């Protein structure tokens, strides 16, 4: 019923948070690349 469709609308919301998650995966990857370059510089 209504609260079911409501917490799976929160679900369409959390996979949009799972769109943020792609974004966070890229930021993690980018931080890793930055650290790699820095240690290479050393």
């Amino acid at each position: 019923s209504n609260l079911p469709l409501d917490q799976l609308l929160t679900d369409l919301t959390k996979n949009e948070k799972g769109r943020l998650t792609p974004i966070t995966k890229q930021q993690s990857a980018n931080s890793a690349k930055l650290t790699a370059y820095g240690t290479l510089k050393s």
Binding site: L5, L8, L9, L12, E16, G18, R19
Partner: protein
């Protein structure tokens, strides 16, 4: 080439979620209005009485 094939075979998780959201909201409405639509004949019968 992997990146290109991925561009061809990888989609907007967001777009798909949006489409599903709209479809989900529509489906419950359809069920409920079907249930209500059955009532109209019932009330015409009530009038019959």
């Amino acid at each position: 080439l992997t990146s290109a094939r991925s561009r061809i075979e990888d989609s907007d998780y967001a777009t798909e979620v949006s489409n599903m959201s709209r479809a989900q909201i529509l489906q419950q409405a359809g069920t409920s209005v079907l249930a209500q639509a059955n009532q109209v004949p019932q009330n015409v019968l009530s009038l019959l009485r």
